[PDB]
Design an enzyme around this catalytic site. Sequence first.
Site, PDB file in Angstrom:
ATOM      1  N   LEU B 134      -8.563 -12.489  -0.670  1.00 51.04           N
ATOM      2  CA  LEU B 134      -7.209 -11.973  -0.547  1.00 51.04           C
ATOM      3  C   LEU B 134      -7.276 -10.502  -0.164  1.00 51.04           C
ATOM      4  O   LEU B 134      -8.214  -9.792  -0.536  1.00 51.04           O
ATOM      5  CB  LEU B 134      -6.417 -12.160  -1.848  1.00 51.04           C
ATOM      6  CG  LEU B 134      -4.951 -11.721  -1.852  1.00 51.04           C
ATOM      7  CD1 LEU B 134      -4.149 -12.537  -0.851  1.00 51.04           C
ATOM      8  CD2 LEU B 134      -4.355 -11.848  -3.245  1.00 51.04           C
ATOM      9  N   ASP B 135      -6.274 -10.054   0.588  1.00 48.27           N
ATOM     10  CA  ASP B 135      -6.229  -8.669   1.033  1.00 48.27           C
ATOM     11  C   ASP B 135      -5.999  -7.729  -0.146  1.00 48.27           C
ATOM     12  O   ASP B 135      -5.269  -8.043  -1.090  1.00 48.27           O
ATOM     13  CB  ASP B 135      -5.126  -8.479   2.074  1.00 48.27           C
ATOM     14  CG  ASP B 135      -5.351  -7.259   2.946  1.00 48.27           C
ATOM     15  OD1 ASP B 135      -6.376  -6.572   2.754  1.00 48.27           O
ATOM     16  OD2 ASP B 135      -4.504  -6.989   3.823  1.00 48.27           O
TER      17      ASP B 135
END
Lengths: 157, 317, 50
Positions: B134-135
Site C-alpha cells: 500500500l502507498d
Amino acid sequence: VSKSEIKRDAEELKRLGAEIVDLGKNALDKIPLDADLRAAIELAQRIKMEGRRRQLQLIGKMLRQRDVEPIRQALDKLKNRHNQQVVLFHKLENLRDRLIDQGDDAIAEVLNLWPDADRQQLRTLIRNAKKEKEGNKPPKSARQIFQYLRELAENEG
Amino acid sequence: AQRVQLTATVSENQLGQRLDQALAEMFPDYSRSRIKEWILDQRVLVNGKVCDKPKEKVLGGEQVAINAEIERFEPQDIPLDIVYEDEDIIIINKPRDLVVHPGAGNPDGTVLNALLHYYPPIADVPRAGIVHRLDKDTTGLMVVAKTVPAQTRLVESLQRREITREYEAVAIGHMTAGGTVDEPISRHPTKRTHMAVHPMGKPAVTHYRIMEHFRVHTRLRLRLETGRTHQIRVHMAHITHPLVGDPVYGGRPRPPKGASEAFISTLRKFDRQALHATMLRLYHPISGIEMEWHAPIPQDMVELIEVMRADFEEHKD
Amino acid sequence: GIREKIKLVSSAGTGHFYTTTKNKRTKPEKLELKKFDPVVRQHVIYKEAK
RNA sequence: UUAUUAAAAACACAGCACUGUGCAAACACGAAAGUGGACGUAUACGGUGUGACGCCUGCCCGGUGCCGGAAGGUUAAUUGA
RNA sequence: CCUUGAUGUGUAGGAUAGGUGGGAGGCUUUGAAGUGUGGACGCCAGUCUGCAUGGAGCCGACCUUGAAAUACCACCCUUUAAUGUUUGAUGUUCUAACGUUGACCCGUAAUCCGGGUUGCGGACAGUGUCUGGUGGGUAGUUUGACUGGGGCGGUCUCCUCCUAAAGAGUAACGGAGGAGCACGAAGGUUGGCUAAUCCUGGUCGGACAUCAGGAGGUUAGUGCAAUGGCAUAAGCCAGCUUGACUGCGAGCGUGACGGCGCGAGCAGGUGCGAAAGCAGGUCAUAGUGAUCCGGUGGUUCUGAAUGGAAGGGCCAUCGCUCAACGGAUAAAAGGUACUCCGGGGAUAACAGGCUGAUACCGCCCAAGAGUUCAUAUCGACGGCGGUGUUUGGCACCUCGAUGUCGGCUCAUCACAUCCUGGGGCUGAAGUAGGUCCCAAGGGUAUGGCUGUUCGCCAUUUAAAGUGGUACGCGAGCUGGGUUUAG
C-alpha cells in the site's frame, strides 16, 4: 552491409596510406611494415605525380587484404598521438627519479617484470648519474638513461 | 565504522587511466563514487604519498594503501494504532506518511521496522508477515498474519481472489454512475515513478461505486481486487477523473468557480492522496469464521467532506 | 586479396618467366613445376614460387 | 541608426573587468621613409566583454587560444664517408 | 675518429660474476707466489700498478649460482682515464662594422637631412636568398548524376530467373538474389564407381555414424547465388601429370565502336593411354579495368660530330574501391532569406477537371434483439451506388507575375429546409413532441476572447441553414495573420 559504407572505409584507408609516403625515411623503419609493402613505399615518392595515384592504388590494394590495426597503432605511437604512448613516457620518466635518486630500490621492479634488463650495466649507469648530479655537472649521461629504458620498452632484443 | 586496512598493487593493464577506475576493479565491493569521496578526504596513500587530484593518470608499479573505515534492518519506535491483536492475525490502521516496506534511504522507521520493535522474533516469517502493499501517502487498514501457516492460506486466497477489500476515495468531477474498469497496466515508458495503463500490460480488474456527489468533487466507495502498486489511482485516472490532492497521479489543481477562501485552503491543507480503507473481510486461519472490521474516517477526510458539503449546499442551492 | 601473385623463372640460364598466383598462407612450399620454354625449345623446371 | 517601408527591446553611453603595451611602446596607415597614437608615459594608450545603482558573479584546464618550463621522441635548408 | 689499462658490488658463494666459442691448462729463471710506499681508479666495500725487498711458483669441475672463473686465446657492449685530429655549444673583454626618434658644433636666422666629437649598445638587433612550422588574414577553384528530407543515408560495374507478349533484344522507386574470389588440384589423360528419401535386420547409437537385403537411374551431387545442362556422366575415387605451353589461327557471333566469346586446323616441344585420340584451364554463364604515364628483363632497334653512355621504341610482366567501373585534375568539402544573371510549367506547392485507398450519404440481402408480431423501430457478417467540402496520387499549366487568410460594402444560385406553409406515420388525449414527403416566396442576430475561419461564453427571437461562386468580391476598402530587408 553497404557498398558506399565500404567505400568511405576504403577511402579512409587510402588517405592513411598517403600519410605513410609523406613520412621520412629515418622514421619509416620504425613501424613493423612488411618488406613487400616497404619496397613499394620508396618507389612511391620518386614516381611522377600520376604514378603516385597508381602507387596509392597499389598501396591501398594489398593493405586492405591484411590486418591494419597494428600498423595504425604503431603509426600512432610514432606520431605520439595514441593515448597509451604518452602515458608510457609519463611512467618512463616517473621511474627516473625513483631510480636516479635511490639507485637500489627501483631496480627490483624492472628486473622482476622485464627479464631483458641488463642489471650489470644499469647499476653502473646510476653510479654515473649519481656522480654528475652530486657534482652539479651538466647531464651529459642522463639522456642515455632514457634511451636504454625506451629501447627496452619495445623489445630491443 | 569498520576500520580495516586496504592495500593492493595495481597491475599493468590499467595503463593510461584515472585514479577512480583503478581502485574499482581491484576492489569490486567499492565503486568509483565511493572511492572518489575518500580520495578527496586525504586518507589514501599512493607510493607512500597522499594525493589530492582524482583525475591523475597512474599506470603501474605503485602500491596503493587505503587506511580508513568501511562500515538486517534496525527496528525503530513508531506509534501504531492497533485495531485487533491476537496470536494468529494482526489488524493495524496505518497512519499517514508510513511506508509498508523500507527501501534505499529508509533503513528504519517503517511498518516492518515498527513491527520488529513491536514483536522482536517477528522476523521469522518472510517480510514480517505482510501480504499486500500500500502507498505510504494513503492511510488505511493493513493485515498481518501472526503465524506462518496463516501466511500460506492468505497468499493462496489472493491467488484465487477470495479476500474482499474496500476503499474510500475522493475524486474530482460530477460523477454519474458506477461501473467496472478492465485495462492492462505496465510501467511508464519515460518516468520510472509512474505506473501507467498500457495495452500490452498486466491484466487488471477494478470496480467502483458512488455514495454521494458534490460541486466538482465526489465521495465514493469501491472495491479493489488486485493490490498492486497504485492500481486504484490509475484506473480512477484512466477515466480522466483523477483523485483529489494526488500529486503524482492526480491532475493539476482546478478549484471550482466561486470557491470560498476556506475551501481553497482545505485543498492546500489536504496535501496528501485521497485514499482510505474502511472495511476488510478475512477468513480465520484455524477456525473458518469470517471476521468483519471497520476503520473510522480520518480527521482530514472528515473536514474535507464537511467543507465540500457546505460549499455544495451554498452555491448550487 | 589473400592470394599473392608470383613469378616462375626457368631453372635454366634464360630470363623468360611466367606469371601466376598462389596462396602462400596455405601452400608456403616452393613449387616443383615444369613448363615449356620457347627460348630453349624444350621443357624446363620452374621454381621459386613466393 | 537603416537618406527613400523597420527610431526599437537595436547601437552608443559614464562606470566595471580582463588582456597587450617601458617609448624607437603595443597597433594602424604605408614595399620604405615617415605619420597617427602623443610632442602622451602604466592613475597613460590599444583591444575585448558587459553596461546606472544595490546584493553578487558559484564549479570544471577535458579540446582550442595564452604564459612559463623544457626531460625526452620526430623534423628542412646546410656539409659530402 | 687512432691505440693507450682498468672498467661491470639482486642473492646463497672462498666474492665489486658482462654476453657470444675453444677450454682441464697456459704463463714464468728473456727471473715468481707474498709482504711497502709513490701515482691513481675508487660507492675506502675493494682492486690495478713502476720499484726493489723477496730467490721458485699460480689454478678449474670443486658443494653451492639462472649462469663458473685473473687458467688463457677473439669479435667486442657500456661507463670512463691521458695525448693528437675535426666540428659544434656557452660565458667574459674590447671597438673598428652597424644602430642610436642621447648631448653638443657646422651647412643654417632649420625639431628635415648630412658632416664632426663624445656617450650608450655592439658583432647583438636588423636587412637580403633558401628552408622548417603557423597561416580562410588573402587569392584560384572543386563539391559529379539519380530522390530524400528536422541533422546522415543509398544507388552508378558485372552475373542469374521472371516480368518479356514462343528469333534476338525490351524499361520502371518491378519481385527475388549473388560477384571483386578460390583451385598448382577442385586441370588433362587413363581406368574405375554411382545417391537422396523410405522398409526390414543390426550393438554402446540417438531422427546420420558405416551397412546386408530391397522399389529409384538422379528428385543426390555438380567449390559459391540462381538458371540451363550433366549417365559417353560435367557427379565420385586412384596412378601419371602441367596443354593453365610458344607463334599462330581460316571462320563465326555479339555489340555503333573500343572490347568480349567460340574457334576447326598448322609448326615445335610435351603429359596421359597400347592405340584410336584428348589436353591452348576449372560444366557454363559474374570473379573485373582501355589508354597515358611508372619498376624489371630481353632486343647493339635507335643512340642530334665519331665510339660509348644517358634517353627513347618494341615485347612479356606485375602496376586501380581509376568503384563517378568507356576510367574531365596526380591534387578539392558546404551555405547564401544579403544574392545576381540566362532559361524552364523540360520540375513542387494552393486552386481547377480524373479519383474513392480512409471516412462521410442512400439502398438491398436479415441471423438476432423486439410483450404476439423483422423492416412499427434497430439490426451483426456482406454487397451496389452518389456529391465528394478532410486525410492522397497521378499528366495540363499562368515562373516575358494566376496576389493570399480574415473583416467591411455588395450579393447570386441549388435544396441535402433553420423558421414560416401543406401533409403522412406515430408507441399523435389537447398543448408540447419525434421521423419522413412536397415546397427556395421571404427572413435567417447582437457582443467579450483571439488576426481570426471555427469555437466557448452572455443574451434575444422564427431561425440565427447547408454548399457552389477557383473554398465570390484589393483596376471596391482593409494589411490585423502570413509578411524581404533591423
